[PDB]
C-alpha cells in the first residue's frame with residue numbers, strides 16, 4: 001500500500 | 011432517470 | 021493506419037493490457053487495428069472491441085449530457101461558451117460513432133459467419149446509430165433513426181430464427197432495441213411490449229440457458245425487468 | 253497554440269464546464285491556453301489547473317503502475333508487447349509532466365506574487381518532477397530527483413517563513429515532500445520526521461485555521477496521520 005499524497009479538491 | 015441498456019461485461 | 025505494422029496477435033494482447041490499465045482509447049485503437057487485418061473476430065475479440073468503444077463513447081455521451089443540460093438551463097429565463105463546448109464534445113462523439121460504423125460496414129458485417137457474429141454486429145450498428153440519434157437534429161436525424169431501426173430489425177429477425185430466447189446477444193439486442201423505441205423513437209408501447217415479450221419468452225424457455233453464458237443472460241433479464249418497472 | 257484565439261475568460265469558463273463534464277484532458281488544455289495568456293492565475297484558477305493536470309497524470313500513473321506490475325511479473329520465472337505498451341504509456345506520462353513543468357518555468361514560477369502562489373507553483377514543480385522520477389532510470393533519474401528535492405525545499409523555506417502551520421498549501425506541500433522522501437528518495441526517517449513535525453506544529457497552532465480553508469487543512473492533517481500510521 002503506497003503512501004498518500006495531496007488529493008484533488010474543488 | 012433514463013432507460014438502462016446493455017452494460018459492459020468482460 | 022497507425023497499427024498497420026503491428027501483428028494481429030500483438031494488437032489483441034495489447035488491447036487486453038489496455039483493458040487492464042483502463043486505457044480504453046488505446047484499447048479501441050488496438051482493436052481497430054486488429055479489425056483492419058481483415059480477419060474475423062472471435063467472441064472474445066468482439067468483447068474487447070465492444071468494451072473499448074462503449075467505454076469511449078460512454079464517457080462522451082455522459083459529458084455531452086452534462087453540457088446539454090447546462091445549455092438547456094441557460095436557455096430558460098449568456099455567452100456562446102456552453103454551446104461551443106457542447107458542440108466540440110458532440111463532434112468528437114459523432115467521430116467515434118462514424119469510426120465504429122465504418123468498421124462495421126467496411127470489415128465486420130458480412131453475409132456469412134455464425135448467427136452470433138451476424139446478430140452482434142447488426143446490434144452494434146443499431147447502437148452506434150442510436151448514439152448518433154441522441155445528439156442529432158433535422159434532416160440528418162431522420163435518416164439516422166431509420167438506419168438504427170433497420171439495423172436492429174435485421175438483427176432481431178436473425179436472432180429470433182437462429183438463437184434460443186435466453187441467448188445473451190439476443191437478449192441484449194432486444195433490451196437495446198426497446199431502449200431505442202422508448203428513448204429515441206418516442207414509441208413507449210412498442211418498447212414495453214418488446215421488453216415484456218423478451219422477458220416472458222426467456223422465462224418460458226429458461227431451460228435454454230447456456231452454462232458458459234447464463235450469468236449474462238440473467239443479468240439482461242433483470243435489466244428488462246427494471247426498464248419495465250421504470251416504464252410502468 | 254490551439255487556444256490562441258479564445259479569450260482568457262472563455263478559456264476559464266470552458267475549463268469549469270470540462271470539470272463538470274469530467275473531461276480532464278480538455279480541462280487541462282483550456283487551462284494551458286489560459287496560462288499562455290501571460291496573466292497571473294488566481295487561487296481558484298490554480299485549482300482548475302491543478303485538478304485538470306493531476307487527473308490526467310493520475311490516470312497515466314495508474315495505468316503505468318498496472319503495466320509495470322505485469323511487466324515485472326513476466327520477468328520472474330515472453331514477447332515484447334508488455335514492455336512496448338508500458339513504454340508507450342510512460343512516454344505519454346513524461347510528455348504531460350514536461351508540459352506542466354514547461355508552463356511552470358515559462359509562465360507561472362515568478363520572483364514576486366504572494367507566498368501562496370509562489371509556494372503552490374514550486375510544490376507543483378516538485379510534484380511533476382516526482383512523477384517523472386517514479387518512471388525514470390539512470391542518468392536521467394538522478395537529475396530528476398535532485399530537481400524535485402530542490403523545488404520542494406525552496407517551497408518549504410518560503411512556506412515556513414510566510415505561512416501559518418495550518419495553511420493548506422503548506423500542509424499539502426509538506427505531505428507531498430514527505431511522500432517524496434519515503435517513496436522516491438529512499439529516506440523513510442526524513443519522511444517520518446517531516447510528517448510528524450508538520451502534524452504536530454499544525455496541532456500546536458490549531459487556532460490559525462482559516463474559516464475559508466479549515467476543511468482542507470484538517471483533511472491534510474489526517475493524511476499525514478495515515479502516512480505516519482502506515483510508516484510506523
Ligand SMILES: *CC(=O)N1CC2(CCCN(S(=O)(=O)c3ccc(Br)c(F)c3)C2)C1
Nearest residue numbers: 019063066067070136140188189192236
Ligand atoms: C460470443 C459473441 O459474439 N459475443 C459475446 C458478446 C461480447 C460483446 C458484447 N455482447 S452483447 O452486446 O451481446 C452483451 C453485452 C453484455 C451482456 Br451482460 C450481454 F448479455 C450481451 C456479447 C459478443
Ligand SMILES: *CC(=O)N1CC2(CCCN(S(=O)(=O)c3ccc(Br)c(F)c3)C2)C1
Nearest residue numbers: 009295298299302368372420421424468
Ligand atoms: C489559493 C491557492 O493558491 N491555492 C488553493 C490551491 C488549489 C490547487 C491545489 N492546492 S494544494 O495542492 O495546495 C492542495 C490541494 C488539496 C488540498 Br485538500 C489542499 F489542502 C491543498 C491548493 C492552490
Ligand SMILES: [Cl-]
Nearest residue numbers: 104105108266
Ligand atoms: Cl470549445
Ligand SMILES: [Cl-]
Nearest residue numbers: 034336337340
Ligand atoms: Cl504499444
Ligand SMILES: [Mg+2]
Nearest residue numbers: 026027028057
Ligand atoms: Mg497480422
Ligand SMILES: [Mg+2]
Nearest residue numbers: 096097098099
Ligand atoms: Mg439576460
Ligand SMILES: [Mg+2]
Nearest residue numbers: 107110155157
Ligand atoms: Mg451539431
Ligand SMILES: [Mg+2]
Nearest residue numbers: 258259260289
Ligand atoms: Mg484573452
Ligand SMILES: [Mg+2]
Nearest residue numbers: 328329330331
Ligand atoms: Mg520460457
Ligand SMILES: [Mg+2]
Nearest residue numbers: 339342387389
Ligand atoms: Mg523509458
